[PDB]
Design an enzyme around this catalytic site. Structure first.
Site, PDB file in Angstrom:
ATOM      1  N   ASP A  98       1.003  -1.080   0.109  1.00 10.46           N
ATOM      2  CA  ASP A  98       0.108   0.033  -0.106  1.00 10.46           C
ATOM      3  C   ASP A  98       0.901   1.312   0.031  1.00 10.46           C
ATOM      4  O   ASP A  98       0.330   2.360  -0.030  1.00 10.46           O
ATOM      5  CB  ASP A  98      -0.977   0.057   1.237  1.00 10.46           C
ATOM      6  CG  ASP A  98      -0.364   0.179   2.543  1.00 10.46           C
ATOM      7  OD1 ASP A  98       0.712  -0.127   2.573  1.00 10.46           O
ATOM      8  OD2 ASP A  98      -1.028   0.546   3.633  1.00 10.46           O
ATOM      9  N   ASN A 153       4.752   0.176  11.378  1.00  8.05           N
ATOM     10  CA  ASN A 153       4.313   0.508  10.196  1.00  8.05           C
ATOM     11  C   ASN A 153       4.128   2.003  10.105  1.00  8.05           C
ATOM     12  O   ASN A 153       3.273   2.337  10.887  1.00  8.05           O
ATOM     13  CB  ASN A 153       2.919  -0.380   9.746  1.00  8.05           C
ATOM     14  CG  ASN A 153       2.521  -0.120   8.079  1.00  8.05           C
ATOM     15  OD1 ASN A 153       2.922   0.504   7.712  1.00  8.05           O
ATOM     16  ND2 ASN A 153       1.463  -1.114   7.798  1.00  8.05           N
TER      17      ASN A 153
HETATM   18 CL   LIG Z   1      -0.135  -1.717   5.367  1.00  7.05          CL
END
Ligand SMILES: [Cl-]
Ligand SMILES: [Cl-]
Ligand SMILES: [Cl-]
Ligand SMILES: [Cl-]
Ligand SMILES: [Cl-]
Ligand SMILES: [Cl-]
Ligand SMILES: [Cl-]
Ligand SMILES: [Cl-]
Ligand SMILES: [Cl-]
Ligand SMILES: [Cl-]
Ligand SMILES: [Cl-]
Ligand SMILES: [Cl-]
Ligand SMILES: [Cl-]
Ligand SMILES: [Cl-]
Ligand code: NA
Ligand code: NA
Ligand code: NA
Ligand code: NA
Ligand code: NA
Ligand code: NA
Ligand code: NA
Ligand code: NA
Length: 129
Positions: free
Chosen positions: A48, A59
């Protein structure tokens, strides 16, 4: 910095991860092994466009700011680069928030797929703790 297995276990224990939200130290060490191979400088890009940083591959989609993840959050209030430091304080503090968010360590896909339900005690076997 690439930590030794027992070196990392000791660092995590000192920072309060042993049995944090009920997760024994071996869970954290196992997660770290498969996320980063104990390398604080590890980075990996997600499909993504977000990026995972540090020993526990935190993340940028939710937890840290890297200036290049559109529409993301920075819920740990830290630059993602801080997650690459030889000093694991920032990574641990952020991991504590992540693991408290409802899904426990399932937040770490590699923990769910490779550590959950296994003999994670083996990861701290022989360590002076
Ligand atoms: Cl992600
Ligand atoms: Cl090193
Ligand atoms: Cl190892
Ligand atoms: Cl210790
Ligand atoms: Cl354990
Ligand atoms: Cl990114
Ligand atoms: Cl991390
Ligand atoms: Cl961003
Ligand atoms: Cl935010
Ligand atoms: Cl920042
Ligand atoms: Cl440290
Ligand atoms: Cl839980
Ligand atoms: Cl997440
Ligand atoms: Cl287990
Ligand atoms: Na290693
Ligand atoms: Na920025
Ligand atoms: Na750094
Ligand atoms: Na670190
Ligand atoms: Na730090
Ligand atoms: Na595995
Ligand atoms: Na495994
Ligand atoms: Na487990």
């Amino acid at each position: 910095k690439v930590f030794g297995r027992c070196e990392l276990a000791a660092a995590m224990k000192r920072h309060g991860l042993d049995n944090y939200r009920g997760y024994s130290l071996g869970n954290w060490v196992c997660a770290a092994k498969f996320e980063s191979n104990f390398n604080t400088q590890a980075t990996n890009r997600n499909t993504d466009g977000s990026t995972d940083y540090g020993i526990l591959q935190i993340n940028s989609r939710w937890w840290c700011n890297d200036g290049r993840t559109p529409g993301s959050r920075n819920l740990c209030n830290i630059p993602c680069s801080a997650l690459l430091s030889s000093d694991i304080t920032a990574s641990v503090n952020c991991a504590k928030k992540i693991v408290s968010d409802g899904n426990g360590m399932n937040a770490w896909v590699a923990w769910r797929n490779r550590c959950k339900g296994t003999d994670v005690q083996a990861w701290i076997r022989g360590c002076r703790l």
